[PDB]
Structures are given as structure tokens and as C-alpha cells.
Write a protein that binds this ligand. Structure first.
Ligand SMILES: Cc1n[nH]c(=O)[nH]c1=S
Ligand SMILES: [K+]
Ligand SMILES: [K+]
Length: 536
């Protein structure tokens, strides 16, 4: 039967299926299209999803949430140590691996984060099975773009424990782009910014899409920013208002604060569609009814620093991607908090009035994209960057990937050593900083360089690609006009789309190491007479 797409979120999970030409987001047994990523252990039973979230106040020590924060991580990781302080449940160290420790049926029990996430995935699998009336095994599960191999493998393991065959682990921003069909657009490469403010995290991702291939250029954000922060600002404001009006602090009473927080959450949602919301609480504290109102402008003022602060990760991602804001072709809004009008206005104003992609429910877009990809898995531009080896085994790119063909690019190079008699032109294809990590396509030598000090000889290297995709690489000694050249054949089927994707993924995985590495060689246009990779 059809594979499902699952957004395994920090706070909630969402499951969708592509059937009958459309994606259907599947509601749970309580009629909810999103299910809380919560697992609760009690004296008599294990609760998953809505039931677990509903009883959290009654059973805080044994209600687990935020397993995504621990997944694929070591106990001594700084993130784990800081996060544990904010959790009611215990996290224990089992041989360097974090485990949640809870009381279940009168017995102490410990679970790895992948096991807790497997329980959430089991609920999502069961919700899909109830809707489809058939067993669901195949699934595509989404993860944040910044997740490392350990976090990705642990997420896959959670699906495997749940009995799911994880066809692929895909980035949440990529899933959102697939939901908007941004990978179906034939033509020149497009730069896409995904603004994801929901699920307790703020994620900004910049992607480039061409020929159905996605590359993550940059990621930025705040792992501890979400709607709860906006609700807290309202709760503190109301606590102050009650204290000023009634000379009473309701902070001591946990239920009164809980009732106020629930009213604030509802009011914030009303403020997305209306300019004012009513707060009506009977007997909030000491028998005093709290009936009041909040304007959208007051809500915006209470959260002004948080809302404006969202632009700082957008600026950082643009800087990391080496792109101006004008170079973004598509902006996608993901996450429930993107419904807030002030956030939409701030982002649109930053982008000079550019329209935002927000037609898909922001809570369901990632699952929607995952479902589209799962169905695909169930049934001219350059593919890779082209360049030559410079001194130190460095990849110097003459043609970036996603360059339309035919194309011709020329750069000038020099000798690295004094009285260097010749240069070796080594042609490589790939996105890595060092040639050892890229693919060698061919090599040729330009000999007879007249003796000169290093940096004086000028060698012009030209990469020419025809419409058929054939690459001709030539080098000319600008002092004599002497030349040498190689023709590199483009075998049809030499590279699969998956082969290209793997090369792009490797660049994304080693981006920090490669970006730091580029700084090491001083010249960047100097050629040696030998292959660095063959040097002992
Ligand atoms: C403001 C807001 N936040 N989250 C959500 O799910 N909806 C809304 S309208
Ligand atoms: K996810
Ligand atoms: K997010």
C-alpha cells in the first residue's frame, strides 16, 4: 500500500498520505491533525499523544516530552546538560548515552530517546492504519537540516523499532519546499528561505534548488524560541495587571497560573485573526473574577524583542549563504507562530514586499512534503562543480554546479615555486574544499614555462562545456601562446540523481570543516607541477 510522510516534531507529530492526487493529513482518534510528542507512564498504563499531554500536570515526573532534544546525543553533550535542568523527568547516563528514567506500573524503567520517539511513531503508524484500513510499513521521516549522522540514524532507529521501514530521512525545510512544489520548477537555480517558527524551535534554512536537487547553503535560528515564549509574556503581563488592580500575586497558585496561561494561548490565536481578544476567567484568585482584554498592538509590544529578533537568524543565514536578501526567489512560512501578523509583516518588510508562501497549513507543511516524497519513493545545468587542483590539494572551482550549459569560464593561474618548468592541470568534479574528497576526471601538463620567480608566469585555464555536456579544458602560457588541452566525455548515466545528491550531502555534512579549510592556502591561483594526493 501507499507510504506515509511523518513530521516527528519536538512538541507534536503529523502524518500525511498522498492518495488520489492529493495529500491528506490524517486526524487521530480524538479528531486532531497533530498529535503531541508526549509519552506518559502511569501505575496502570502507557499513554501516547493527547492522553499523555492532557495528564501532564497530574503526572509530571513520568510524562516524557522533548525526546527529539536528546536523540542521537551523548549524555555529556552541553545541550543535554543545559536541557535536563528544565525537565521534570529524570535523564540518566547509561554508558555515555542519555536515557529517560520514569516510574511505570510501580517499577523504575529507563528508555533511550529513540525508544520514546518509537512510541510516538507507533501512535502515528496506528493513526495512519486506522485511516487507511490497512497495515502501514513504509514511511519518510523528517529531521532538522542541522541534525548530524548520529541524530539521523537514531531517528531512523526509532522508525525501525516502531515497525516502520524508513525509506528516507529528509530535512524538514526540504519537505516544506517539496510541499510548495518548488522542486518541480524547471529552469535556473532558485534560492529558497524556509522560516520555521513552531514546535519550540526557530529554524531558518537557505536552500538552492535546480534539476530536482536541493542543497542546504545555510542554517540559523534559536533552539529555545517558540509560541510558549509569546504566551509567557502575556501571562506575566496579566499577573502584573491583577497585582496592580487587586493587590494580589496569583503566582503562588499553580492552577490559577495554569488557567491564565490557557486563556492567554487562546487569546494569542484570536489576535492572529482579530485586533483584540477577551480574557474571561471566573474566580481566578481569592474569588475575584478576571475579565479583561488585550489588543494585538499590546501583544506585539509585549513580544517586540522576540518578534524583531527573528530577523537576526535570517541575516546570519544570508551571510553564511553568501547571498543578498534580493537573491531569495521563494520564502516559505512553516510553524504555527508564522500565523502571527507582526512576524509576517516583519519578514515581508525585510524582503521589500516580497509575497510569502503560506497557503499550506504551517503546522502540516513538513508532513505534507514528506507524504509527497514518500509516494515518489513508492512510485540543462551542471550537476556538480568543476575545477582544478591548486597548490596544497585545494579545489579551485571554475564552474559552479547549477550553471546553465553551454558555458565557458576562464581564470588565470601562476606557478607556486621559483623557476617552475611546468604546471599540472588536474580536473576535478565535486563540492568539497579538497581534491582528495572530489572526483578526478582527467589531467594534462603544460611544460616549457620560461624560468621566472613564483607568481610571475601567467597560465590561462578555460573550461568549455557544449550543449551536449562535453567538457573541454585548455591551458595557455600567456607568455608564449603554447597550449595543451583535454576533452572529458560525459557518459550518459555516469552520475545518478542519488550520486549527485550524495556529493551535495557530503558537502553539507563537512561544510564547517571545508569552510574553515579554504582559509589555509594564501594564493588560491597557484599551480604546482605534481599531484598533491600522490605526495607522501
Ligand atoms: C498565533 C498562533 N500560534 N500557534 C498556532 O498554532 N496558531 C496561531 S494563530
Ligand atoms: K520532523
Ligand atoms: K521550528
Amino acid at each position: 500500500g501507499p507510504a506515509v510522510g511523518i513530521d516527528l516534531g519536538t512538541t507534536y507529530s503529523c502524518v500525511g498520505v498522498f492518495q488520489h492526487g492529493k495529500v491528506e493529513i490524517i486526524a487521530n482518534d480524538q479528531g486532531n491533525r497533530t498529535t503531541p510528542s508526549y509519552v506518559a507512564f502511569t501505575d496502570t498504563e502507557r499513554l501516547i499523544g493527547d492522553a499523555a499531554k492532557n495528564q501532564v500536570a497530574m503526572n509530571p515526573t513520568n510524562t516524557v516530552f522533548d525526546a527529539k532534544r536528546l536523540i542521537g546525543r551523548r549524555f555529556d553533550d552541553a545541550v543535554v546538560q543545559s536541557d535536563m535542568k528544565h525537565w521534570p523527568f529524570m535523564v540518566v547516563n547509561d554508558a555515555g548515552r542519555p536515557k529517560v528514567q520514569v516510574e511505570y506500573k510501580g517499577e523504575t524503567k529507563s528508555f533511550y530517546p529513540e525508544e520514546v520517539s518509537s512510541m510516538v511513531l507507533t501512535k502515528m503508524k496506528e493513526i495512519a492504519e486506522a485511516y487507511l484500513g490497512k497495515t502501514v510499513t513504509n514511511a519518510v521521516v523528517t529531521v532538522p537540516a542541522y541534525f548530524n549522522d548520529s541524530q539521523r540514524q537514531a531517528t531512523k532507529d526509532a522508525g525501525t523499532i516502531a515497525g516502520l521501514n524508513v525509506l528516507r530521512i529528509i530535512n524538514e525545510p526540504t519537505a516544506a519546499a517539496i510541499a510548495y512544489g518548488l522542486d518541480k520548477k524547471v529552469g535556473a537555480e532558485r534560492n529558497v528561505l524556509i522560516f520555521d517558527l513552531g514546535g519550540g524551535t526557530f529554524d531558518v534554512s537557505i536552500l538552492t534548488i535546480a534539476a530536482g536537487i536541493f542543497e542546504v547553503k545555510s542554517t540559523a535560528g534559536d533552539t529555545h524560541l517558540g509560541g510558549e515564549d509569546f504566551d509567557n509574556r502575556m501571562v506575566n503581563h496579566f499577573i502584573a495587571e491583577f497585582k496592580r488592580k487587586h493587590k494580589k500575586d496569583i503566582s503562588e497558585n499553580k492552577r490559577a497560573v495554569r488557567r491564565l496561561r490557557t486563556a492567554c494561548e487562546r487569546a494569542k490565536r484570536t489576535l492572529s485573526s482579530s485586533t483584540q481578544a477577551s480574557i474571561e476567567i471566573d474566580s481566578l484568585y481569592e474569588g475575584i473574577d478576571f475579565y479583561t482584554s488585550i489588543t494585538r498592538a499590546r501583544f506585539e509590544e509585549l513580544n517586540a524583542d522576540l518578534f524583531r529578533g527573528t530577523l537576526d537568524p535570517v541575516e546570519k543565514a544570508l551571510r553564511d549563504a553568501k547571498l543578498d536578501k534580493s537573491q531569495i526567489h521563494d520564502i516559505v512560512l512553516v510553524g504555527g507562530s508564522t500565523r502571527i501578523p507582526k512576524i509576517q509583516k516583519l519578514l515581508q518588510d525585510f524582503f521589500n514586499g516580497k509575497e510569502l508562501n503560506k497557503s499550506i497549513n504551517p503546522d502540516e507543511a513538513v508532513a505534507y512534503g514528506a507524504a509527497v516524497q514518500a509516494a515518489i519513493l513508492s512510485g540543462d545545468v551542471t550537476p556538480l562543480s568543476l575545477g582544478i587542483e591548486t597548490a596544497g590539494g585545494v579545489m579551485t572551482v571554475l564552474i559552479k554546479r547549477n550553471t546553465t550549459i553551454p558555458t565557458k569560464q576562464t581564470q588565470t593561474f601562476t606557478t607556486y615555486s621559483d623557476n617552475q618548468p611546468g604546471v599540472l592541470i588536474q580536473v576535478y568534479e565535486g563540492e568539497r574544499a579538497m581534491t582528495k574528497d572530489n572526483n578526478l576526471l582527467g589531467k594534462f601538463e603544460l611544460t616549457g614555462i620560461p624560468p621566472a620567480p613564483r607568481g610571475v608566469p601567467q597560465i590561462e585555464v578555460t573550461f568549455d562545456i557544449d550543449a551536449n555536456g562535453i567538457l573541454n579544458v585548455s591551458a595557455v602560457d600567456k607568455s608564449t601562446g603554447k597550449e595543451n588541452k583535454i576533452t572529458i566525455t560525459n557518459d550518459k548515466g555516469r552520475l545518478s540523481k542519488e550520486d549527485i545528491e550524495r556529493m551535495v550531502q557530503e558537502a553539507e555534512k563537512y561544510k564547517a570543516e571545508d569552510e574553515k579549510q579554504r582559509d589555509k592556502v594564501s594564493s588560491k591561483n597557484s599551480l604546482e607541477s605534481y599531484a598533491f594526493n600522490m605526495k607522501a
